Nucleic acid binder design. Sequence first.
RNA 1: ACCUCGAUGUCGACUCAUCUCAUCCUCGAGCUGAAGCAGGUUCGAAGGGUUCGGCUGUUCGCCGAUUAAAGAGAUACGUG
RNA 2: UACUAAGUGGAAAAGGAUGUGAAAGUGCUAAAACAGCAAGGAUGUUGGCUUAGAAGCAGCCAUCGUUUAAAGAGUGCGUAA
Lengths: 125, 128, 136, 37, 176
Amino acid sequence: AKKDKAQQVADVSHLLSTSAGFVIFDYTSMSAIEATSIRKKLFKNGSKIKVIKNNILRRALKAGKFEGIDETAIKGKLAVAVGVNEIVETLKAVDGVVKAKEAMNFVCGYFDNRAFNSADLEKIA
Amino acid sequence: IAKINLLGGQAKPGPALASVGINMGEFTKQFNEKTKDKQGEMIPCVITAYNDKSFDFILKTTPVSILLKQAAKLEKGAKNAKTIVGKITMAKAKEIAQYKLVDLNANTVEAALKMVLGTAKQMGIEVI
Amino acid sequence: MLQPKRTKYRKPHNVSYEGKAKGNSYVAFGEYGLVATKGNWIDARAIESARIAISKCLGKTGKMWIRIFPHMSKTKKPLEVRMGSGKGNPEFWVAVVKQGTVMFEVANIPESQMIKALTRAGHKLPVTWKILKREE
Amino acid sequence: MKVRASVKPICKDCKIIKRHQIVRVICKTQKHKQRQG
Amino acid sequence: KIGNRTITLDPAKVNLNFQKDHIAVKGPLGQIELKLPPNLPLKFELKDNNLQITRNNELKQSKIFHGTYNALITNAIIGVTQGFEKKLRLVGVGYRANVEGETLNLQLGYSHPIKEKIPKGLTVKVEKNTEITISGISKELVGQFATEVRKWRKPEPYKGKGVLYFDEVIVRKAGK
RNA sequence: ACCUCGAUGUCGACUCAUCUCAUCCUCGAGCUGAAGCAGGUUCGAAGGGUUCGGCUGUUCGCCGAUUAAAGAGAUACGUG
RNA sequence: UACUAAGUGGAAAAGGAUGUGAAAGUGCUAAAACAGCAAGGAUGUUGGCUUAGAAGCAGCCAUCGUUUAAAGAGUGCGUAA
Ligand SMILES: [K+]
Ligand SMILES: [Mg+2]
Ligand SMILES: [Zn+2]
């Protein structure tokens, strides 16, 4: 329904308004065990990793008042990692998770209200 | 990757992993090492196959729902689910779920209970 | 084989089926029924074939109601005989089926399975069948 | 080739086409070819 | 739909000139000619580094042409800019292939000698004795010659032997 | 029981064949519980060919030995 | 003024069919639809009957919980397991 979609956008927008990290990742080459393994490593219950469709992400980021973050979610498969408080460890966790696996892309995101690029992910990790 | 149910007390008569380029003589000692804590049981083992003929192995628990027969006190469950032959306390299910944790991919102990609850119902056992 | 146990008069007038289904117009016991769109005579043998088809494809869950019945007999003169000099013996019984009589009907089993059962039935009957559902 | 008065798909992938005004069926398993209606 | 598809005619060496009943498409590999029939209901207009074409009406055959000439234009463009090729694995025991001048000759289980004349614009190559690589400019001719080679000894399921097209999984029937 | 009784000659064989295809062979193709050989069935095809003998009034048939095969039918159950 | 592509019209059925036209509603649709293309499509489980060999697949008895965006004691194919 229009109402169901609005609720999903509003909930996501509200979550992005209190996040300390939003990091965009291609979901390519991620196995079912890998999906449970990455979440399990993210151990502490303050972080989430979810495959989210672009249209939801875009509306949610737009209403959370984010800008220039469109490129991370532009024309690509887009899982999201969003953590709370000490956000640096979450980036290292996902960075060592790909490296352990065959491959995975790490597009970029926002750290503590600041845009970073794909190349800057290694710096944080 | 070829999974096999190699017995824990014995590993020596055999060839279906020999076409993988596995050096059988070097790994038979390893199967009888870590498995010696659970001798007399048939332990499943995952076998990854690296290109360089290196190999690393992961042992697993004895198959699920076999333990449910022991907790129920009855050698075999009903052939018909509506026929409630046996009953098991929820506290006894906690003891069973903990054993399976290494095999189970369950996120929580409370979820690990729920996974075993779908196995107890297969035997027709009441959850009390 | 459906057959009246005993009848009063052994050789009656043939009943023309050219009508619009006096009686049995509508399905009355199940959810789906088989209707005819061209009146005809279907004998006891065809009712048997249709019944066994429905039963075989129905499984051990549902129920089938047969609405028509071969009340009327019918004669057939023996072969290689001149005409006249009597009326031939009765041979086979037949149920008159006017256009639009819900003759078979099923119950207590999924939808698609009933539709398939009815289609498997109506291919034995000569009448151009059709599928009707109970009203409400 | 099966020539039959009534042609209906037998497999999941046996599609139905109409070639030269004649309805036919094609399956990856060649046992299912049909023709003439 | 393919009728409403935006062709990107790259202005490197590919030029397109529409006459009343012919289209001439030229590129780095070799000029291609398309023989359109009269009463064509499509209106072909081209832009710089783009092409869009539309039909006048909604008639059925017009709707078919709207797609099929778009497809032919795209295939002609891609052929004249890159060229097509087909690849045939000649699999068997005493089978082999080779070229002699314009004629590709073949040895199969036949007691009869096998030769075949290659048409213009198609070049075959036998890089290995059990491989044929047929290179052309239009899909139609390369496919035609591929099947003219293949007709001679079709594959079998009992043993995979045949003029198998590369990467085709012939089914298996096991006889004893 | 409609023409034919102020006559339309009837079985089988002989001679001569003619035509149809729902094909026996020859020919082309598919599917196969088709490895090969040989087949089973289906599709198209009627150009041509399609045995000799014993017994029987014979057709039909049973049997022998052949052949690539020894077709089913029609033509007043063709043809005095 | 529409309909027909079949020489229908200019013989005929049970039955089969993405032929084409008309009308009626119903469902998704530019917070991206349908097809196709790029990823994944798991653990309990090798539940047990038992077959030298049947462990998702020769068949048979219950035929569900669990990790997540997703998962069928597995859609079907294909394995002496
Ligand atoms: K007379
Ligand atoms: Mg005379
Ligand atoms: Zn099929």
